[PDB]
Amino acid sequence: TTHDIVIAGGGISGLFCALRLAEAGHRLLVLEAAADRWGGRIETEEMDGFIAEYGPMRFEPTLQPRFAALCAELGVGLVDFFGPSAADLPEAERGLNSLQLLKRGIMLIMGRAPDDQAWIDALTEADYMRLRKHAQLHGQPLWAMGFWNALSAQGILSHRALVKLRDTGTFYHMIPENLNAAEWIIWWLRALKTVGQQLASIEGGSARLTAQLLARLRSHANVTLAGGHKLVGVRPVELGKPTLALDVATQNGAVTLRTERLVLALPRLPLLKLTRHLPEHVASQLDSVNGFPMLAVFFVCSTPWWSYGQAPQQYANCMPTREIHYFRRPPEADADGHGMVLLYMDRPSTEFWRHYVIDGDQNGRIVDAFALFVARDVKRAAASEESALKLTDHARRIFGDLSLAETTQYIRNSIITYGIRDWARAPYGAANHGWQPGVRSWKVMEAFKAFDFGSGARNLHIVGEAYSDYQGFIEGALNSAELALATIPAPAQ
Numbered sequence: 001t002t003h004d005i006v007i008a009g010g011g012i013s014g015l016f017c018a019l020r021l022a023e024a025g026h027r028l029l030v031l032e033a034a035a036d037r038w039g040g041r042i043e044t045e046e047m048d049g050f051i052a053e054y055g056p057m058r059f060e061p062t063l064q065p066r067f068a069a070l071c072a073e074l075g076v077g078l079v080d081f082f083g084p085s086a087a088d089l090p091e092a093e094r095g096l097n098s099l100q101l102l103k104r105g106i107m108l109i110m111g112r113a114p115d116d117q118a119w120i121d122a123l124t125e126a127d128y129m130r131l132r133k134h135a136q137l138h139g140q141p142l143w144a145m146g147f148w149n150a151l152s153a154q155g156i157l158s159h160r161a162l163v164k165l166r167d168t169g170t171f172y173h174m175i176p177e178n179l180n181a182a183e184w185i186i187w188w189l190r191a192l193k194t195v196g197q198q199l200a201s202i203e204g205g206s207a208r209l210t211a212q213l214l215a216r217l218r219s220h221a222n223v224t225l226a227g228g229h230k231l232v233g234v235r236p237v238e239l240g241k242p243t244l245a246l247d248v249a250t251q252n253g254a255v256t257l258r259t260e261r262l263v264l265a266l267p268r269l270p271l272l273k274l275t276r277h278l279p280e281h282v283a284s285q286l287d288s289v290n291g292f293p294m295l296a297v298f299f300v301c302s303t304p305w306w307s308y309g310q311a312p313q314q315y316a317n318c319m320p321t322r323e324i325h326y327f328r329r330p331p332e333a334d335a336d337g338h339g340m341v342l343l344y345m346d347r348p349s350t351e352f353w354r355h356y357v358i359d360g361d362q363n364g365r366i367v368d369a370f371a372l373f374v375a376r377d378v379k380r381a382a383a384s385e386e387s388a389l390k391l392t393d394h395a396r397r398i399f400g401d402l403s404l405a406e407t408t409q410y411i412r413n414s415i416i417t418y419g420i421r422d423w424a425r426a427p428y429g430a431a432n433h434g435w436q437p438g439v440r441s442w443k444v445m446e447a448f449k450a451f452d453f454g455s456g457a458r459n460l461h462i463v464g465e466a467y468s469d470y471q472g473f474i475e476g477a478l479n480s481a482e483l484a485l486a487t488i489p490a491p492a493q
């Protein structure tokens with residue numbers, strides 16, 4: 001079968017392109033490799049009555065207008081999230097938490113006063129574009145440097161400030177790979193705006209965005225949705241002509257398709273798997289970004305050791321979990337006193353394994369390692385008297401007495417259900433992506449938004465977060481999508 005447009009990938013960028021293109025009148029097929037679900041890195045589970053988000057959970061709608069507008073268009077309500085969160089240095093640098101020390105370094109790199117919040121607040125995408133293209137540090141373009149290198153530069157931080165960023169986990173958790181300085185500076189500048197505070201979540205779980213989008217698409221007769229179909233090959237039907245032949249694996253076999261246009265709504269790893277089928281000038285740029293790891297771990301406990309309102313805790317260097325969130329039922333509507341713990345572990349999973357997992361299912365060994373981790377935290381709280389972890393007095397005396405081994409066993413045994421998502425694993429290969437130093441991102445984005453095998457047809461496109469100007473977010477996926485959608489002509493009469 002021939003299709004006028006084929007979109008490979010049913011994550012948010014792919015489905016959004018399907019929507020815009022359907023609305024413009026094109027006839028199109030969306031291929032999604034997973035047999036069981038749509039939405040890609042947007043994944044929500046109901047776990048013992050709790051909403052577990054393996055991907056996005058909270059949003060900042062003022063920083064993410066395309067997302068906000070899409071939600072509004074699809075009748076996806078956003079609900080304000082009010083829940084809780086969070087000496088030896090030189091004079092200038094004493095005072096500041098890690099974020100503020102980072103900000104200072106950035107502000108100084110950009111030749112600004114650290115307190116210059118009005119400039120941060122004023123910066124637009126066009127400013128950001130001039131920053132990546134033109135900003136330099138000691139004569140070197142920032143797009144050419146690692147962000148560690150940038151932060152380490154003459155006149156930016158004291159030698160000790162650098163050490164302190166190391167100890168707070170800045171380089172272990174937040175900036176794990178020393179990626180593109182220009183791109184990191186832009187991203188932090190945006191995130192440091194005043195307006196960047198009002199937090200929301202999606203009513204009914206993040207996957208309600210996907211479900212609404214799917215419902216809309218199902219109402220457009222010029223859209224076909226095919227789950228369980230993975231693009232595994234593409235080439236021109238004939239060299240020098242635009243029409244593409246596609247090879248598609250299904251559950252039970254394969255299908256060969258023809259199309260005039262192919263949207264690859266895919267991140268780095270799935271494109272790497274297609275590398276030999278892609279035009280050379282695109283293939284050779286697939287490593288312009290790297291993938292960031294994330295393991296999202298959820299477990300529901302029959303006998304939680306924390307109360308309603310417990311705030312999330314962030315961890316520092318050498319603690320493989322970036323962050324632990326705690327959840328309880330609303331204390332009026334609390335049938336069972338069950339709680340849920342969400343742990344984000346942002347180090348390479350083979351490093352986590354080699355340090356924390358007893359070899360003698362992998363899932364069960366990982367939960368065990370996490371029970372021990374949590375046990376140490378509970379013991380240190382019980383012994384501490386002032387702790388960010390507000391234990392009860394039931395908990396406080398039990399855990400005070402119990403050994404570490406007994407605390408581990410107790411936590412382990414209280415787990416009635418768990419889920420683990422390792423985003424680094426095939427087929428995703430990453431939670432999100434970042435530009436390499438030495439890459440001019442605007443050139444890659446320009447090449448990827450429309451390209452071909454040399455005929456000039458410009459009828460292949462890459463869209464998604466991975467190679468966007470706003471990595472880490474749905475907003476990035478949507479910006480990348482719009483870049484390519486602006487290159488696609490309205491359908492033939």
Ligand SMILES: Cc1cc2nc3c(=O)[nH]c(=O)nc-3n(C[C@H](O)[C@H](O)[C@H](O)COP(=O)(O)OP(=O)(O)OC[C@H]3O[C@@H](n4cnc5c(N)ncnc54)[C@H](O)[C@@H]3O)c2cc1C
Binds near residue numbers: 230231
């Ligand atoms: C832990 C985590 C936290 C996040 N936090 C936030 C946050 O706070 N805010 C926010 O805005 N964003 C957040 N994001 C990102 C957001 O989830 C976006 O969906 C993501 O950034 C990408 O959407 P996308 O279309 O690029 O691709 P994906 O979501 O990667 O979709 C790609 C799709 O392609 C399919 N596929 C792969 N190979 C093939 C093939 N060959 N053929 C067919 N289909 C194929 C996959 O099955 C997948 O469904 C987070 C992500 C994660 C994982």
